[PDB]
């Protein structure tokens, strides 16, 4: 990051501390929702958030810049408190907020401020509000991967890696507990965002390395880890369609990266280390096909593998979301039957009767080896 941007993020952190942002967010979304999904403050709930600030927080000017960041709500530049006003100008210069053409208002740009798992996080606002296709991913799968981590088991000396870090959320969560975190990605846009989010939570290169590196290169490297997290691209799209960097999995069925990671865990994890993965896995009525491929790791390497299935959908319920996404992502018109192509692909190639949103915990050199699949 440039020095001017670094100073601006430091001043943003100061503002969030002054007005208690994380507590305000936590109160608005409530403890029964805070760790369920990042899609809580959205275009559909913004009016309710504005009403809360107006009627339960008195419309106080100290929260005006905060709402520009949380929902994009415009604030009059002249109504900003003196200290907040200079910071607002710095955020506009950085492209993190917008000014109206006459300079009289400040409002949202393409970054939304949330909190997750105790960290403060800017994300791509287009994922929850209108507009062009988003360029940084975050979702409920991101959250559930972190939910199952046993934080009290993390030592300050444990070497941790978050592959495919995106916004940085998993790496930043790990940094709450260990002093050694590596966060990787290959996309320009997520790499610039995790740089900001690292500084926003008072981490630096001393405790969290940000590295531009393909996961396949990190997997075959000689660095060894005690703890690994990865939410990789895992979605399979029909032949002839392009997705995005964060969505499109490798291999015939979109699971190539999951195979790459799992296959290397006995070599890249120290003995007794643990990995946490998440993916929306296709399967039949019994369960996800991918879990059938993992018995080799139990019998071949003595691993313990636990699969937590937290949501089940029929394949028919994904035809609309997937086909809509493909249409938006490639800028396609509305006269091709993408839904039929998705349906045919699910049936012939994926053999997908259901999609199983699954967090997978894997441990090497297990005292109690085996595969356990948990469904409600």
């Amino acid at each position: 990051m440039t020095p001017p941007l670094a100073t601006t993020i430091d001043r943003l952190r100061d503002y969030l501390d002054r007005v208690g942002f994380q507590q305000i967010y936590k109160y608005i979304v409530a403890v029964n929702h805070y760790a369920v999904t990042p899609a809580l403050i959205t275009r559909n709930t913004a009016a309710s958030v504005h009403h809360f600030f107006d009627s339960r927080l008195g419309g106080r000017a100290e929260f005006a810049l905060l709402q520009c960041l949380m929902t994009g709500r415009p604030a009059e530049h002249a109504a900003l408190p003196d200290k907040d006003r200079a910071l607002a100008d710095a955020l506009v210069t950085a492209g993190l907020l917008r000014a109206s053409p006459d300079g009289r208002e400040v409002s949202g740009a393409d970054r939304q401020l949330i909190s997750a798992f105790g960290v403060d996080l800017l994300i791509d606002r287009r994922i929850h509000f209108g507009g062009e296709v988003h360029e940084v991913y975050i979702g409920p799968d991101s959250y559930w991967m972190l939910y199952y981590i046993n934080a009290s088991g993390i030592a300050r000396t444990h070497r941790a890696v978050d592959l495919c870090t995106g916004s940085g959320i998993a790496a930043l969560y790990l940094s709450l507990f260990t002093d050694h975190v590596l966060a990787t990605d290959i996309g320009d846009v997520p790499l610039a965002l995790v740089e900001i989010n690292r500084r926003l939570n008072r981490r630096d290169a001393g405790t969290m390395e940000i590295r531009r590196e393909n996961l396949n290169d990190t997997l075959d490297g000689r660095e060894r880890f005690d703890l690994l997290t990865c939410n990789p691209p895992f979605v399979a799209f029909p032949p002839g369609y392009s997705g995005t960097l964060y969505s499109q999995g490798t291999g015939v069925d979109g699971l190539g990266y999951m195979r790459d990671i799992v296959g290397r865990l006995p070599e890249v994890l120290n003995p007794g280390g643990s990995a946490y993965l998440v993916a929306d896995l296709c399967g039949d009525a019994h369960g996800p096909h991918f879990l059938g491929e993992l018995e080799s790791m139990v019998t071949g390497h003595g691993m313990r593998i636990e699969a937590f299935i937290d949501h089940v959908l029929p394949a028919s319920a994904q035809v609309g979301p997937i086909s809509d996404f493909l249409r938006h992502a490639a800028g396609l018109p509305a006269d091709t039957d993408i839904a039929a192509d998705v349906q045919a692909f699910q049936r012939e190639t994926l053999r997908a009767d259901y999609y199983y949103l699954t967090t997978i915990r894997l441990q090497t050199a297990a005292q109690n080896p085996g595969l356990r699949m948990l469904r409600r």
Partner: peptide, 10 residues
């Protein structure tokens, strides 16, 4: 529905 489109979003 609710819960759909993971690694996709939006």
């Amino acid at each position: 529905x609710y819960x759909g489109x993971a690694x996709v979003x939006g």
